Amino acid sequence: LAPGASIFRCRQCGQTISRRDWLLPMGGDHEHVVFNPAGMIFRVWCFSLAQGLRLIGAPSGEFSWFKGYDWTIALCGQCGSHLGWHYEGGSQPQTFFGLIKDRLAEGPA
Ligand SMILES: O=C1CC[C@@H](Oc2ccccc2)C(=O)N1
Ligand SMILES: [Zn+2]
């Protein structure tokens, strides 16, 4: 009854992005802490599915945090906030989203 932790929205604008139900335990955990080559740390949650994003450019394998996957930058389709990455080109699953947990807001359906 009345769950308050069902939907993830863009923290900056409220755009609908994903659901707790769609969390994906990649390598046995949904949470992955990673750094980019600029040394920025991200707490990434893996989702099987997401919506309301805009995927920018073509995939790159360069410095992929997930073995066998190529990444594309995922912006909030509404406000342009960088919310994470779409991963593709791999196996089991072929694709998923790695979203930056602190750039989302969790709340009711
Ligand atoms: O899996 C990923 C996705 C983002 C990616 O960041 C950059 C990669 C190359 C150059 C600049 C940033 C990364 O390090 N790993
Ligand atoms: Zn947004």
Q: What is the CATH number of the domain that holds 69?
A: 2.170.150.20
Q: How far apart are CA 107 and CA 25, in angstroms?
A: 21
Q: Whose CA is nearest to atom 15 of ligand 1?
A: 64
Q: How far is the CA of 12 from the centre of ligand 2 (A)?
A: 5
Positive or negative, the CA dihedral 62, 18, 40, 31 is: negative
Q: How far is the CA of 42 from the centre of ligand 1 (A)?
A: 11
This structure's resolution (Å) is: 1.7
Ligand 1, CB cutoff 6 Å, lining residues:
36-37, 62-65, 71, 85
Looking at the structure of the chain, the number of domains it has is: 1
| Domain span holding position 10 | 5-109
Residue 60 to residues 20, 26, 28, 56, 87, Cα–Cα distance (Å): 27, 19, 24, 11, 9
Q: Are 23 and 47 in contact (CB under 8 A)?
A: yes
